[PDB]
Amino acid sequence: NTTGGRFVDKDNRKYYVKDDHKAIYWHKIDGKTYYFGDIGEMVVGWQYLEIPGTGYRDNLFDNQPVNEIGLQEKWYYFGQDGALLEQTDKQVLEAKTSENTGKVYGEQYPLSAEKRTYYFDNNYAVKTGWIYEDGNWYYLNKLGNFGDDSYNPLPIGEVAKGWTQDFHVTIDIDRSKPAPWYYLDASGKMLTDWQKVNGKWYYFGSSGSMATGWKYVRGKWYYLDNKNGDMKTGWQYLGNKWYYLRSSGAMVTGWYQDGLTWYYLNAGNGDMKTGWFQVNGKWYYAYSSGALAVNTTVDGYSVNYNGEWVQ
Numbered sequence: 486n487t488t489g490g491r492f493v494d495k496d497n498r499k500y501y502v503k504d505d506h507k508a509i510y511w512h513k514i515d516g517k518t519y520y521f522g523d524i525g526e527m528v529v530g531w532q533y534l535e536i537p538g539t540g541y542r543d544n545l546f547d548n549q550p551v552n553e554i555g556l557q558e559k560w561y562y563f564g565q566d567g568a569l570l571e572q573t574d575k576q577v578l579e580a581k582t583s584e585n586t587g588k589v590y591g592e593q594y595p596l597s598a599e600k601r602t603y604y605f606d607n608n609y610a611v612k613t614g615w616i617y618e619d620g621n622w623y624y625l626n627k628l629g630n631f632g633d634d635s636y637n638p639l640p641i642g643e644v645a646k647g648w649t650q651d652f653h654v655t656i657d658i659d660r661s662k663p664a665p666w667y668y669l670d671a672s673g674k675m676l677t678d679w680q681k682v683n684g685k686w687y688y689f690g691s692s693g694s695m696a697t698g699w700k701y702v703r704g705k706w707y708y709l710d711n712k713n714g715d716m717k718t719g720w721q722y723l724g725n726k727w728y729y730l731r732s733s734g735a736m737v738t739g740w741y742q743d744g745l746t747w748y749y750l751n752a753g754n755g756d757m758k759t760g761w762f763q764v765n766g767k768w769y770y771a772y773s774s775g776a777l778a779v780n781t782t783v784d785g786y787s788v789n790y791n792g793e794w795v796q
């Protein structure tokens with residue numbers, strides 16, 4: 486909705502001039518959309534810009550005041566004629582690199598020999614976050630790379646691979662909200678259920694998020710590292726209590742013999758018993774190591790070879 490002007494070629498740049506003024510930022514002109522930066526030069530190709538539509542960066546000319554405004558920046562694609570690609574689904578385009586972004590009409594730059602499928606939101610911006618494609622989930626980076634007073638927005642919108650945290654983010658990471666870990670394979674597909682990664686087992690369930698701590702899966706209990714997620718095995722001291730996990734990771738309950746020694750893991754909680762305890766009417770004593778006492782005396786009471794108390 487900007488009329489009364491005309492495009493102008495001058496000094497190897499292109500502008501839109503009306504009543505002798507230069508257009509700047511966003512403008513809707515005769516069915517298409519263009520962006521002319523801060524001083525009027527029409528942009529082309531990949532651009533990381535403040536979202537249009539609010540009016541604060543729209544329909545403006547260099548002879549008008551430009552207000553302070555905090556608008557998020559996102560990725561957009563413009564044709565070589567300056568027209569914004571108003572895609573709302575997806576399109577295969579030249580990959581955005583460190584040498585084909587932020588260019589203006591008349592500037593010289595290479596065209597990526599590599600192309601990628603880019604997804605877009607309903608407002609023509611490159612889409613970020615989770616997406617569901619052909620039976621699988623994919624994660625499109627929400628953030629670029631940080632580096633001590635440094636930030637590179639290039640990775641944004643790209644398909645994430647490997648271990649990835651899904652932070653809540655607008656202009657910055659919302660550190661108050663949760664940021665679960667996920668794992669996307671070589672083609673970007675999100676993994677589910679049990680998975681062995683870098684020599685260790687992890688559980689991503691049905692939602693994909695990496696489990697931590699105790700987890701009940703298909704009738705058994707597993708303990709995934711509270712912080713790292715990796716599945717534990719063997720003896721583990723958790724919450725001031727001992728537990729024995731099979732090599733499969735599953736928690737053991739009942740009587741267990743380690744070498745020659747017998748231990749009793751609580752039927753309900755699975756925690757190792759110490760002191761005198763009773764099993765199915767019978768009485769037994771386990772030392773502080775959890776080790777069952779056999780054929781000997783304990784503070785006056787005798788126990789046979791099965792550790793059973795005998796009157």
Ligand SMILES: CN1[C@@H]2CC[C@H]1C[C@@H](OC(=O)[C@H](CO)c1ccccc1)C2
Nearest residue numbers: 648649650666683695711712713714715
């Ligand atoms: C392979 N994963 C482990 C370490 C790298 C990723 C992240 C996983 O989840 C985490 O919480 C780890 C714990 O060290 C982590 C590493 C670095 C920053 C934040 C979290 C564990």
Ligand SMILES: CN1[C@@H]2CC[C@H]1C[C@@H](OC(=O)[C@H](CO)c1ccccc1)C2
Nearest residue numbers: 679680681686702707716732733734735
């Ligand atoms: C939770 N269960 C699944 C993943 C671990 C356990 C047992 C099965 O997985 C395995 O048996 C794998 C096979 O490589 C395994 C890895 C390391 C030691 C033992 C078994 C299914």
Ligand SMILES: C[N+](C)(C)CCO
Nearest residue numbers: 615622675692693694
């Ligand atoms: C992978 N998700 C879409 C499925 C679930 C949590 O974000």
Ligand SMILES: C[N+](C)(C)CCO
Nearest residue numbers: 699706753754755756
């Ligand atoms: C033993 N737990 C994993 C089973 C239950 C919480 O006390």
Ligand SMILES: C[N+](C)(C)CCO
Nearest residue numbers: 761762768769786794
């Ligand atoms: C079971 N008792 C007879 C053995 C010991 C006291 O708790």
Ligand SMILES: C[N+](C)(C)CCO
Nearest residue numbers: 720727743773774775
């Ligand atoms: C750790 N312990 C006391 C539990 C068991 C011996 O392997």
Ligand SMILES: C[N+](C)(C)CCO
Nearest residue numbers: 740747777790791792
């Ligand atoms: C000897 N028991 C009581 C310890 C274990 C099952 O045979």
